[PDB]
A paper describes a structure:
The ferrous iron and 2-oxoglutarate (2OG)-dependent [name] prolyl hydroxylases (PHDs/EGLNs) catalyse trans-4-prolyl hydroxylations on [name]α subunits, thus promoting their binding to the von Hippel–Lindau protein (VHL), a targeting component of a ubiquitin E3 ligase, and signalling for [name]α degradation under normoxic conditions. The PHD-catalysed hydroxylations of [name]-1α/[name]-2α in higher animals occur in amino- and carboxy-terminal oxygen-dependent degradation domains (NODD and CODD). The three human PHDs exhibit different NODD/CODD selectivities, with PHD3 being substantially more selective for CODD than PHD1/2 (refs 16). Biophysical analyses employing crystallography and NMR reveal that the molecular basis of PHD isoform and variant selectivity involves enzyme–substrate interactions involving β2/β3 loop residues (that bind the LXXLAP motif) and helices α3 and α4, regions which display sequence variations between the PHD isoforms.
Comparison of the ODD complex structures and those without substrate reveals clear differences in NODD/CODD binding, especially in β2/β3 loop and C-terminal regions.
Numbering used by the authors: 185 to 404
């Protein structure tokens, strides 16, 4: 058993999947050893108190209705004790680089830092939402899941995606060493169903050059 080269995974699987469905799941992305190291680094972030409630990020005010029960932190990838998260981010970047110019009409020219997120069980989730509804430049959502032996039947935590205007929907279990791509805009409203166990994931959003520039123009 051998890893597929990034170029081959990108052009033979990710590009066609994305252009046909707007969603692409890649399992066994990095392997057990690396995935476990990433899990250790995320758990260290959690135990040392680096997470902030995601509700604080998404709410309009402290009176707003509940949106999300996760806790998050932003990782650049070069921080001490986050080197393996940095390797994950470089691996994502390599796939996108081999895709660029073939994912719809997008020209991807940047990305966010990594959003490390924890749903601490207790029935927490994330109401249905669109990641980028107002044209802030993000065109692709990329999520890496880190949860060993996750049993959705008992622990829940399914990501459910409802592709706009299609007669289908997708259920993504937050499985260990799974990589997920999907269009960030209104085409993919999605929700995280209540999680009854600790659920970790790492997300990066990629930027489309033209839309991000236009967003900067409205910005100014
Ligand atoms: O963690 C997941 O499966 C999905 N998370 C989100 O939709 C988000 O944080 O915006
Ligand atoms: O089928 C889809 O589009 C997404 N879900 C999966 O890849 C799975 O549950 O294995
Ligand atoms: Mn989302």
């Amino acid at each position: 058993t051998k890893p597929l080269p990034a170029l081959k995974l990108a052009l033979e699987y990710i590009v066609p999947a994305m252009n046909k469905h707007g969603i692409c799941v890649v399992d066994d992305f990095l392997g057990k050893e690396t995935g476990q190291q990433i899990g250790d680094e995320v758990r260290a972030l959690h135990d040392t108190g680096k997470f902030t409630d995601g509700q604080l990020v998404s709410q309009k005010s402290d009176s707003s209705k509940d949106i999300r029960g996760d806790k998050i932190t932003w990782i650049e990838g070069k921080e001490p004790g986050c080197e393996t998260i940095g390797l994950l981010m470089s691996s994502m970047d390599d796939l996108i680089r081999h895709c660029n110019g073939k994912l719809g009409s997008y020209k991807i020219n940047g990305r966010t830092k990594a959003m490390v997120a924890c749903y601490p069980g207790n029935g927490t989730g994330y109401v249905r939402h669109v990641d980028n509804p107002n044209g802030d430049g993000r065109c692709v959502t990329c999520i890496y899941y880190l949860n060993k032996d996750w049993d959705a039947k008992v622990s829940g935590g399914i990501l459910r995606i409802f592709p706009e205007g299609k007669a289908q929907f997708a259920d993504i279990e937050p499985k260990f060493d799974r990589l997920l791509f999907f269009w960030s805009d209104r085409r993919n409203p999605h929700e995280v169903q209540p999680a009854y166990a600790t659920r970790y994931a790492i997300t990066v959003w990629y930027f489309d050059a033209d839309e991000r520039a236009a967003a900067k123009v409205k910005y100014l």
